[PDB]
Each structure stands twice: as structure tokens, then as C-alpha cells.
Subunit: 137 residues, 2 copies
């Protein structure tokens, strides 16, 4: 049950990151929204962020209210022809994102212990094909 | 962001299974509880099932109320020295589980298209080490 092994490994890794991030009080998915904002250079729309964070739109709206309440995000227009609200991080958020990335790097280091760089690369190519098979549905 | 590629691939595969199962009206995780019951030979406790399905206990209790309401599961004692409630499938559930497994096999077939048996095996060994690294925390 290949799909089950993938889901279990993914759940275990996100549990471990949620544990290492637990001091930050960023409950529900909220730290994972921040992490994804930190990682893309474009400012996403709500629709784009929900896609990548992996959550329904109405769920993201609640997550975003939380982060916005804490002064970590704003919903803003970003171009003369991008008038919809885009989600942008604030300067306040930067000491926070720096810490979240450092902790996410720590979990990545530790969970990859003992795994060969070539085998990691091969594992990634298998996952990318599974994803293309799904996305090309 | 290896962890992100794993989570995205896992989310895409579970989305696809949820799509193929959508006619069965087994909303929230409920079909995934059934699938896990179908796949283990022992009857799990609530604690065991929550672990493997990947959900908090109180969340599983609601999922289970749903399935129990539909006559798909019972919570029962299973031994003279296993007096706690164990979750058992009903005979009613069998035409249902048969269909869910057939559909889960279809998704597995299709998402593995183009991926070599050796590379699948290698991918699984990488995931198993990541999981052991996490479980040996
Ligand atoms: Hg892999
Ligand atoms: Zn913490
Ligand atoms: Zn992202
Ligand atoms: Zn359906
Ligand atoms: Zn199971």
C-alpha cells in the first residue's frame, strides 16, 4: 500500500515539524501558510495559497484571519492589473519566518539522516512522476 | 523542499482517491477509516485506528459515529482480556469495502504509470528510513 506509506511518512514529518514549531503558538496549519509565503517570491492570491498549503479556501480564510490578527500578513493589491487581494508578509513576520525556516531545515537534516544523496534524488523523481500522473488527470 | 514534495504528492493522491470514492457519500476522512479497517486483520482500538488513519482521537470519534450510524462499524469487546472497545466492520460493510479497495487499486495502478518496479522499491526504502528516523525520535 504504497500510497499509505507515502501518507504516513508525510504525516510523521509534518507532526515532527509541528512539534518543533509548537512554541510559536501558530496553531492549525498556520505556520505552513507562513512557510509557503516565505518560499515563493510572488505574492499569491488566496486561491494559489490554498492549492499549495493544501486546504480548502474557507479553511484558509480562517487561517489567514489568525495570521492577519497577529500582524504577520496583509491582503493587498500588487499591480495596476492585479487588483485582487494578494497575501503578503509583513516586516514583523521576518524574525518569525527566519526561525520557522531554520527549524524546518533542522527537521529536513534529521529526517534525511542515513539517506544517500543519489537515492534522495531518485526518490524525488519517483514522487514527481506520481504527481504528474495525478496532475495530468 | 523535499518534505513539501512528499506532502504535495500525498495530498494529490488522497484527492484523487477522494474523487473516485465521492459517489459513496463517505465524507470527511470516513472512507479512509474503512480502508484501514479492511486492511488490518486485528480489530484496532480507537487509539490504534487514530494513529494509522492519521487523525486526533476526538476527530476519529465523530468519524466513527458517522460510520456506526450507517451500520458499517461496531465498537465491541474482542477477548476475555481485551474488554476495551475495538472497532469491527460489519457484514453490511463488505460490499462497500470491496468497492473501496477496487477503486484504491485503480488509483494505485494509474499513479504508478511509467514508474519502474525497481525504482518504486527504492522509493519505498527511502520513505521507510525517513519514517524510522521520525519514529526513532
Ligand atoms: Hg520516494
Ligand atoms: Zn516549539
Ligand atoms: Zn509554497
Ligand atoms: Zn464517486
Ligand atoms: Zn491501517
Amino acid at each position: 500500500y504504497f500510497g499509505t506509506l507515502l501518507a504516513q511518512t508525510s504525516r510523521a514529518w509534518r507532526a515532527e515539524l509541528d512539534r518543533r514549531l509548537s512554541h510559536l503558538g501558530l496553531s492549525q496549519a498556520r505556520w505552513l501558510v507562513l512557510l509557503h509565503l516565505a518560499r515563493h517570491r510572488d505574492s499569491p492570491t488566496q486561491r494559489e495559497l490554498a492549492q499549495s498549503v493544501g486546504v480548502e479556501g474557507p479553511t484558509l480564510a480562517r487561517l489567514l484571519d489568525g495570521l492577519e490578527s497577529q500582524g504577520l500578513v496583509r491582503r493587498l493589491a500588487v499591480a495596476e492589473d492585479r487588483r485582487a487581494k494578494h497575501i503578503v508578509l509583513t516586516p514583523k513576520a521576518d524574525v518569525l519566518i527566519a526561525d520557522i525556516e531554520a527549524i524546518a531545515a533542522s527537521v529536513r537534516n534529521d529526517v534525511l539522516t542515513g539517506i544517500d544523496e543519489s537515492e534522495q534524488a531518485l526518490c524525488q523523481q519517483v514522487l514527481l512522476r506520481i504527481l504528474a500522473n495525478l496532475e495530468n488527470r
